[PDB]
């Protein structure tokens, strides 16, 4: 749910340096051309930019997974895969 997703974006941003971020931004630029002209300085600004372009939400993780793979960040990737597992397990309560 929304809380687990908030925690995920916090966890990720906590592990994305500004140096890291320039890499993630470059990997996105061909897919979302307005990226350059947007002045993204934080991890949380990057995630907001992805959300506003329909590339990320609590149930839509595949693009950041893609970007983490191509950026060779299995550490960030594993937080996303673990979040997906958690969300699936939570859903087993209400079935």
């Amino acid at each position: 749910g929304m809380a687990e997703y908030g925690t995920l974006l916090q966890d990720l941003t906590n592990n994305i340096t500004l140096e890291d971020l320039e890499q993630l931004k470059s990997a996105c630029k061909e897919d979302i051309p307005s990226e350059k002209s947007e002045e993204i300085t934080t991890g949380s600004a990057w995630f907001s930019f992805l959300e506003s372009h329909n590339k990320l939400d609590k149930d839509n993780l595949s693009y950041i997974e893609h970007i983490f793979e191509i950026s060779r960040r299995p550490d960030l990737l594993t937080m996303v895969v673990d979040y997906r597992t958690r969300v699936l397990k939570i859903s087993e309560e209400d079935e």
Partner: protein
């Protein structure tokens, strides 16, 4: 103009009596009767000019295979395209017809040890030539190993090939091509550069394993799963091997994982020649710098019946690209392809 499945396949009058083989991204394959050489041949129609990366792949394959001459590497016999650059939308590459490939064969039958030995030797004999040219194939896998009806093997598919250059960083050219996940060396997954000839040796180790059991050794479904399949067999990397990962974030990730013990090869491959397994161990070494290289693999006891430097040709000289193709716009690549293909024109 000849037609197939309602598509233009304009290779006549030289090439006639077409038969559709199959289809892929941007290219269909037919066999055809070659009225000059009086044999059937394979022809792939490629239509790359709207995509920079497809133009890159097309030009790399043409340039390399036109320069290479080796029994275990597929040649290019002919190339057909339009007489003017403006009208050129497709390129038809004519090659020796090969009845099958290793992927199909492994779906069909379990191989004797003598056939596994012979196929491995031919893969490495072809790779010895490629590497002697300072070229990395980068896409070795069973479907890129063509075979005839008498076990003669030819390496194909040179679209991802590059001159070896450990020091140069990525452009996403290899990365956006992902039907080759199962044969990808760990350093490609973990580091963005520093790759050497050892990446191809890894893929050959994967192919050897696949010939032993008729199944892929590391069939991961995604990125993390792929790394888990490798580590679940090789065991956790050593400290020395963790220091091959320049990527500090990747390295921390690997260090976070639960310990895994190495699985002995003979547990996984209980019917394999023990010399074959000793070779496999050296090809599937995590550390790309310690991994066995092609001449040493050929000289291994498993291949002693075949190893024969007097009957293993190498390249006269290193292969070079005049300029890096990876940064050239698709229109410039189109011009280079027009130029590369000119020598095959009737009016040349």
């Amino acid at each position: 103009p000849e037609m197939v499945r309602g598509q233009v396949f304009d290779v006549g009058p030289r090439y006639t009596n077409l038969s559709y083989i199959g289809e892929g991204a941007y290219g269909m394959v037919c066999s055809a009767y070659d009225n000059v050489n009086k044999v059937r041949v394979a022809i792939k129609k490629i239509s790359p000019f709207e995509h920079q990366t497809y133009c890159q792949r097309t030009l790399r394959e043409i340039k390399i295979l036109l320069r290479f001459r080796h029994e275990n590497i597929i040649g290019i016999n002919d190339i057909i395209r339009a007489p003017t650059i403006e009208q050129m939308k497709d390129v038809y590459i004519v090659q020796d017809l090969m009845e099958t490939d290793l992927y199909k064969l492994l779906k069909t039958q379990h191989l004797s040890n003598d056939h596994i030995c012979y196929f491995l030797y031919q893969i490495l004999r072809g790779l010895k030539y490629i590497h002697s040219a300072n070229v990395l194939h980068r896409d070795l896998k069973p479907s890129n190993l063509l075979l005839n009806t008498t076990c003669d093997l030819k390496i194909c598919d040179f679209g991802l090939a590059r001159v070896a250059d450990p020091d140069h960083d990525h452009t996403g050219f290899l990365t956006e091509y992902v039907a080759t996940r199962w044969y990808r060396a760990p350093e490609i997954m973990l580091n963005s550069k520093g790759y050497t000839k050892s990446i191809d040796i890894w893929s050959v180790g994967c192919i050897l394993a696949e010939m032993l059991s008729n199944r892929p050794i590391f069939p991961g479904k995604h990125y993390l799963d792929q790394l888990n399949h490798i580590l679940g067999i090789l065991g956790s990397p050593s400290q020395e091997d963790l220091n091959c990962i320049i990527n500090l974030k990747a390295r921390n990730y690997l260090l976070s994982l639960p310990h895994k013990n190495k699985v002995p090869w003979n547990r996984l491959f209980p019917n394999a020649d023990s010399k074959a397994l000793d070779l496999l161990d050296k090809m599937l070494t995590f550390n790309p710098h310690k991994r066995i290289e092609v001449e040493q693999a050929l000289a291994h006891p498993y291949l002693e019946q075949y190893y024969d430097p007097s009957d293993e040709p190498i390249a006269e000289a290193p292969f070079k690209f005049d300029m890096e193709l990876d940064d050239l716009p698709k229109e410039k690549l189109k011009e280079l392809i027009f130029e590369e293909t000119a020598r095959f024109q009737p009016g040349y």
